[PDB]
């Protein structure tokens, strides 16, 4: 928040690039392993394919 709306188009930076992933809800063309943490058998499901992003903590317009 304290970084919010303190910017505008056209600047130069040295952000923190702390990349993290999507905790997806559903996926399209994410046909890598399709599975789940499901117990075994003896006497709709979900899938998993993500994509990347980034994140930050600090700015210096230069």
């Amino acid at each position: 928040s304290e970084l919010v709306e303190t910017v505008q188009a056209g600047d130069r930076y040295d952000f923190t690039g702390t990349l993290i992933v999507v905790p997806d809800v559903s996926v399209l063309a994410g046909v890598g392993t399709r599975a789940e943490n499901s117990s075994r058998h003896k006497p709709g499901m979900r899938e998993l394919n993500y994509r990347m992003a980034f994140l930050a903590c600090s700015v210096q317009a230069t």
């Binding site: 075994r40 058998h41 003896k42 006497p43």
Partner: protein, 587 residues
């Protein structure tokens, strides 16, 4: 309501004693031959006929015409039980060290190794379920895996949809909890090939109706038809209680023995050695005009090509024609487009094509369907356009890059499209207002850049002025074919188009040469072109490839004389036709 078992014995008697000596050379066993050919394990798919069972008995000749299913699994398992001599090798490895009776016992389909089909829309009425019937392709599709049984539990399918199973429905995981997991062991899984494709010929569609169009074939039968083949195909609904499986694709037109390049003629080929009778049987419909026909017969001839130094050479004839009287150059293009295997037709413009290739031309929806047209598809063939002159000015550049050969680039969507334009072309156009005023010269009388008039090996205006006697001939010859049905009477024995293409097929692979003897002679004769035409700058231009053209026609002609010996005769006609191409407006 027949018995399902004693029939098995009857067909064992059918399969065993099949040595019907109807021709000298069949005292041996015919289906014994096919039996033992399955003993070669070459044939993974066997074949059945109506004439087969016509002799043995007559029930099942129509007892099975109604079901064609259960009879066929018993046909499977019966001769699966018969041993009169990848997966196959892996299973022995799987059963090499082998609860020995309480087993997940294999179904005979899991060791397929052999298969069967059989032999005997508007009219198809909806009372044909289960009947194996025949009817005479659009949106051709591709080939993918289709299961028959997954494994070692067997979960066989006849349906098209499925769902995976869990645990194991055996005794191992029955009451006892000791057990393991179960997954698809591919190395031991059994699949089958698969293609899918969808319409009527339009020769049986009602006047006040619209041609309507589903075919599902699995296994080996795939890849036995292409988009746009006139085919015959030899009924099962698909699970309010609101498709077809085939075995064979026969085409009396566009198939292996009717198609060129896809011996039989030897008895007649020994009898037949000629070059001129083709005109007598190529399009008898019109009297005279031997030259135009024979020029096209050269385009039918072909057999000219080389790929030296990395680059090819344009080895297809590309003729253009301008002119418009009583010429009737519409019956010719139609004639060629009919007999010519892998033919096409477009017009000057018409609709959805514009006598062109493919284009990404608006606000309709979202597809980016390059839509290959006639000019796209005619390759290894001819696309026969009519009235090219009226086509379009912007269009002339499309014929420019496609002229050379195999080259149609489309840098409009962001793709290197090729489309491999290997098509011979036939161009037919008409003079402007007036009828080829002989005084009004070329590009004075017409208005097309000399870039495209030049790049034709031959241009051939055909005109006939007023002759009191000539058209009389034109009258009576035509009236012969109407008072009667067949034009040429007691002159030459014309040839059926099937035979005609048959003999034509024996002309395409020949690789004709050209002794050195013509190296000097041809360049000497060609010199005359660059002197007596270029002597006056009011004369036609000439191309570097121009001599190569008459070259191309010469070597092509040897395909139909074959013996590798282009003699003074196979360029003497080359020049004969080249000179006859011209000098018709002076006289």
């Amino acid at each position: 309501r027949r018995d399902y078992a004693q029939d098995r014995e009857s067909i064992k008697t059918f399969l065993s004693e099949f040595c019907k000596c109807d021709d000298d050379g069949k005292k041996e066993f015919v289906y014994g031959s096919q039996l033992v050919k399955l003993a070669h394990r070459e044939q993974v798919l066997i074949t059945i006929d109506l004439d087969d069972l016509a002799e043995f008995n007559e029930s099942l000749a129509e007892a099975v015409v109604d079901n064609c299913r259960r009879y066929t699994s018993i046909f499977s398992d019966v001769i699966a039980e018969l041993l009169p001599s990848a997966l196959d090798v892996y299973i022995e490895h799987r059963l090499m060290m082998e609860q020995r009776d309480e087993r997940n016992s294999f179904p005979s389909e899991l060791m397929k190794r052999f298969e069967v089909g059989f032999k005997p829309i508007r009219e198809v009425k909806a009372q044909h379920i289960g009947k194996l019937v025949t009817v005479r392709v659009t949106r051709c599709t591709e080939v993918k895996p289709m299961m028959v049984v997954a494994t070692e539990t067997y979960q066989p399918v006849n349906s098209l949809s499925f769902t995976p199973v869990h645990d194991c429905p055996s005794d191992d995981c029955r009451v006892n909890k000791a057990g393991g997991r179960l997954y698809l062991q591919t190395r031991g899984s059994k699949f089958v090939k698969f293609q899918e494709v969808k319409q009527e010929h339009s020769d049986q569609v009602p006047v006040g109706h619209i041609p309507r169009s589903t075919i599902m074939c699995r296994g080996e039968v795939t890849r036995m038809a292409q988009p746009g083949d006139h085919i015959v195909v030899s009924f099962l609904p698909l699970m309010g209680l609101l498709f077809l499986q085939a075995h064979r694709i026969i085409c009396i037109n566009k198939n292996d023995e009717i198609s060129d390049k896809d011996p039989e003629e030897l008895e007649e080929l020994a009898q037949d050695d000629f070059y001129e009778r083709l005109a007598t049987s190529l399009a008898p419909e019109i009297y005279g005009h031997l030259d135009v026909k024979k020029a096209l017969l050269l385009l039918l001839v072909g057999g000219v090509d080389k790929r030296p130094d990395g680059m090819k050479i344009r080895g297809n004839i590309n003729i253009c024609l301008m002119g418009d009287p009583g010429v009737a150059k519409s019956q010719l293009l139609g004639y060629i487009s009919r007999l010519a295997v892998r033919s096409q037709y477009t017009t000057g413009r018409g609709s959805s094509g514009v006598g062109l290739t493919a284009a990404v031309m608006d606000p309709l929806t979202g597809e980016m369907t390059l839509e290959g047209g006639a000019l796209v598809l005619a390759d290894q063939g001819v696309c026969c356009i009519d009235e090219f002159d009226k086509m379009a000015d912007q269009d002339r550049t499309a014929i420019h890059e496609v002229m050379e050969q195999q080259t149609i680039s489309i840098a409009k969507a962001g793709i290197m499209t090729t489309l491999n334009a290997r098509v011979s072309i036939l161009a037919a156009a008409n003079p402007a207002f007036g009828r080829y005023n002989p005084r009004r010269t070329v590009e004075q009388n017409i208005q097309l850049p000399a870039a495209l008039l030049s790049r034709f090996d031959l241009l051939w205006l055909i005109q006939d002025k007023p002759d009191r006697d000539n058209d009389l001939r034109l009258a009576k010859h035509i009236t012969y074919v109407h008072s009667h049905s067949k034009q040429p009477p007691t002159r030459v024995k014309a040839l059926d188009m099937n035979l005609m293409r048959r003999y034509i097929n024996l002309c395409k692979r020949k690789n004709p040469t050209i002794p050195d003897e013509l190296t000097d002679y041809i360049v000497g004769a060609y010199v005359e072109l660059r002197r007596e035409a270029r002597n006056q700058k009011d004369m036609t231009f000439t191309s570097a490839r121009n001599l190569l053209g008459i070259l191309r026609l010469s070597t092509a002609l040897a395909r139909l004389r074959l013996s590798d010996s282009v003699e003074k005769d196979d360029v003497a006609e080359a020049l004969r036709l080249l000179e006859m191409s011209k000098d018709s407006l002076n006289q």
